[PDB]
């Protein structure tokens, strides 16, 4: 009764990073076959936790978070790694005892006319709490004049588009991301897959 990792990684549509998706994984044997899951991921790094057959351990819950951002900003998804995405589009805890994986998606998410499905939360009042999310889509009345729910002069919308085009280089090519949070509460661990 293995965990549904195939649903997470090989999903057709990934989420915009601002409304980053989260798939709970519980009550299943999480046998990690990333060494031969038939996909040469750009890179991989387990923060705090280790990938060296640590499957033996039993975790309470595993929250798998998914989204797409630009290669340039692939690093932003790390503990202490401040930036747009970190500060406005999902963030990890400094004590992140979890793995993170991501890869090039230019041949999955780059669209001829530009890809505008993926949106990055540009601005926000405060930095996001770890694993917090915001889907706020309200105009900000920066101006001393109102916005009347429209965007314009000193009246701004809180989102923007990555406009992915294959012509673009590695830096601005779409890169999908999957995160592995390992929860251990008082509830009996539901996932080991030793």
């Amino acid at each position, epitope marked *: 009764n293995l965990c549904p990792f195939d649903e997470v990684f090989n999903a*057709t*549509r990934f989420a915009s990073v601002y409304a980053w998706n989260r798939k709970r994984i519980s009550n299943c044997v999480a046998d990690y076959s990333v060494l031969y899951n038939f996909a040469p991921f750009f890179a991989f790094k387990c923060y705090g936790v280790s990938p060296t057959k640590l499957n033996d351990l039993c975790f309470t819950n595993v929250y798998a978070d998914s989204f797409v951002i630009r290669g340039n900003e692939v690093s932003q998804i790390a503990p202490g790694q401040t930036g747009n995405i970190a500060d406005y589009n999902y963030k990890l805890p400094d004590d992140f005892t979890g793995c993170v994986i991501a890869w090039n998606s*230019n*041949k*999955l*998410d*780059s*669209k*001829v*006319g*530009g890809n*505008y*499905n993926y*949106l990055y939360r540009l601005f926000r009042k405060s930095n996001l709490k770890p694993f917090e999310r915001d889907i706020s*889509t309200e105009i900000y009345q920066a101006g001393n004049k109102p916005c009347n729910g429209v*965007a314009g002069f000193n009246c701004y*919308f809180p*989102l*923007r*588009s990555y*406009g992915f085009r*294959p012509t673009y280089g590695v830096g601005h090519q779409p890169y999908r991301v999957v995160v592995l949070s390992f929860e251990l509460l008082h509830a009996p661990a539901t996932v080991c897959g030793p």
Partner: antibody, heavy 131, light 113 residues
Framework: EVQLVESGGGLVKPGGSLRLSCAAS????????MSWVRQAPGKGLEWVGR??????????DYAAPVKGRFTISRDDSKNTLYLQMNSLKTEDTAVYYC??????????????????????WGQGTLVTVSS | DIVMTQSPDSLAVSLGERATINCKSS????????????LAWYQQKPGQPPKLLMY???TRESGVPDRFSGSGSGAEFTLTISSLQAEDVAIYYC????????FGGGTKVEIKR
């Protein structure tokens, strides 16, 4: 190449029922938001309906005049689109195109376009609703 | 839905002259979330299917000449052909995709000779 071949148009009695069928080939069919667009003689294009990719839900939308008289279907294993037409009227006499129009702006398909484009239309069969 | 409108209905200019079409929407097709117009232009020669010219209101389809060029934003778009060629004769439709699909009234383009 890619091709969209509509079949099953003709004469049908007023109030009668007719099944249109669009056989698609060349592109990743199941990922595209397929639509029917009709055209009466001399009159302009009019969107009929849309089926989204089954991974994107498979929601159907219909226009105001055909609202709840038509029923869109899909078969991704056979790469074929259907339009079920019921309680037909003399207003409905028109040539019906199946198309990938309105898809690429929302759909999940990437840059590997078959012939370097995405918007494709069929020749479209003529539905005459006369007694 | 959105009432796509076109003007004029008929049009006729000499070879190599300025051919000018317009579009009016009952709503705005400018989506704030990406700042893109969800509008297209379609060329249809009699007896044939429509061919896509323009999408995102500006972007040309592979192989369409620079002759064609769509502009505008929001609810008052326009497609102008710099110099009208013989084959350019056709009816053109401004279809927005912002809300499902709704096509314009139509603008017939003809050559003076």
């Amino acid at each position: 190449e890619v091709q969209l071949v509509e079949s099953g148009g003709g004469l049908v009695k007023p109030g009668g029922s007719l099944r249109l069928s669009c056989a698609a080939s060349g592109f990743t069919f199941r990922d595209v938001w397929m639509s029917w667009v009709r055209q009466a003689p001399g009159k302009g294009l009019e969107w009929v309906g849309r089926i989204k990719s089954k991974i994107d839900g498979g929601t159907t939308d219909y226009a105001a005049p055909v609202k709840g008289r038509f029923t869109i279907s899909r078969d991704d294993s056979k790469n074929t689109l259907y339009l079920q037409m019921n309680s037909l009227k003399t207003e409905d006499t028109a040539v019906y195109y199946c198309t990938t129009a309105g898809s690429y702006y929302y759909d999940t398909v990437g840059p590997g376009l078959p012939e370097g484009k995405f918007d494709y239309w069929g020749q479209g069969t003529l539905v005459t609703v006369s007694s | 839905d959105i009432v796509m409108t076109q003007s004029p209905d008929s049009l006729a200019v000499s070879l190599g002259e300025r051919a000018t079409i317009n579009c009016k929407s009952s709503q705005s097709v400018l989506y704030s979330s990406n700042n893109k117009n969800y509008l297209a232009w379609y060329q249809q020669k009699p007896g044939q299917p429509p061919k896509l010219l323009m999408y995102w209101a500006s972007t040309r389809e592979s192989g369409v000449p620079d002759r064609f060029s769509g502009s505008g934003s929001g609810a008052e778009f326009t497609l102008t052909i710099s110099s009208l060629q013989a084959e350019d004769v056709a009816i053109y439709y401004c279809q927005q995709y912002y809300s499902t699909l709704t096509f314009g009234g139509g603008t017939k383009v003809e050559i003076k000779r």
